[model samples]
Target: SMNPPPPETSNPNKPKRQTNQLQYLLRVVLKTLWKHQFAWPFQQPVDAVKLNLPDYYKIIKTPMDMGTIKKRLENNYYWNAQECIQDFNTMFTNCYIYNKPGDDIVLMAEALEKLFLQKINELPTEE
Candidate 1:
């Protein structure tokens, strides 16, 4: 019943693949992890480590969804070793448009760029 649209030719207004959005997403996720890992239980004090797990979880998965998180928050979904391959497959699968690369939102990366820029444009500017 449902059909995808055809890819239209590039236009002056159409967005292009500007930067590595996927890589940027990954970098931020990794940076937070790199920071979080070196944070807790490091040398320094002998004080009790309590349960800082919730705090760390929030920072790591704050933006992730498709699952019910208690309260702290959800970050982009995290994948374990084997999970990575599945997720990559899942991501590639999810990005598909089922159409030719000629219409708006036809190409995976450009479509993502459109959405990514959409989110940025909708954000409140501090002036």
Candidate 2:
């Protein structure tokens, strides 16, 4: 008998207009990352069996990739820019963890990480 469901009250402090702008910004960043040559290696999930790296899954519990992130963005899975950036951070962190320092893939990840940092800084600070 404790159910009194009234119409939801929207907050005036939140502006729906800027949501689309943020989405566009994120999309542009994603596309730029995808266009990079280094992006190919990180475009899809690591196939541990195919790559013969059995320990990859063990080391990278929360795997992230550009393709997966794109799908997430297309599906409206991210609520804010920070959440999106965190996933990109996780992807690079995983690369750094699983690959050796001098490995070519690791080098690519490093380059992409630098690009990502620069790109995200371009995004407007909502605060």
Candidate 3:
């Protein structure tokens, strides 16, 4: 079993909450990218109007091998959602989508960002 590295600590007086905020934001971005990376290969259309986390996972779960997915993500070391989305989108357009991929890609991307934001909102915050 691989033990994770220790998290960095900040000075209590400075209270660098921005670090936490940035970390969460990055997580959201990477989550979106991860969602697309796994989902797009199955050629599933994202439904914006009725989108939910469980529904999203359900669609991708069919094609994705959970262990392999976890390993790949761990190896990649994605820090933020922005980086994840950027690379994922590039992959989606260049590799995943073929033979006239529809306009729905844009909508799917937007929906992903929104979904991540929702998840982040639910996380417990340090007071």
Residue-wise lDDT of candidate 2 within 8-117, one digit each (tens)? 22334533333653575556788888899889988877777677787777677788888777766665665577767878898899998988889999999888888888
TM-score of 3: 0.28
Best by lDDT: 2
lDDT ranking from best candidate downward: 2, 3, 1
Error of 2 at 27 (Å): 2.8
Give, for candidate 2, the lowest lDDT window spanning 10 residues.
Answer: 1-10
Task: lDDT for model 1, please.
Answer: 0.29
- Note the Cα lDDT for every prediction shown: 0.29, 0.73, 0.39
TM-score of 1: 0.23
Residues 1-127 of candidate 1 have per-residue lDDT tens digits of 1212312222445333322332343444323322432322221111113432333322222122111111101232322222222332332232243324664323543443344344434433322
Q: After superposition, how far is residue 4 of candidate 1 from its true place, in Å?
A: 19
TM-score list, all predictions: 0.23, 0.79, 0.28
Q: Which candidate would rank higher by TM-score, 1 or 2?
A: 2
* Per-residue lDDT over 7-118 for candidate 3, one digit per residue giving the tens place of the 0 to 100 score: 2222235322233434554455344545565345323233323443343333332222222323334444444444433433443343223223345644554455456556
Candidate 1 runs further than 4 Å off = 1-85, 108-127
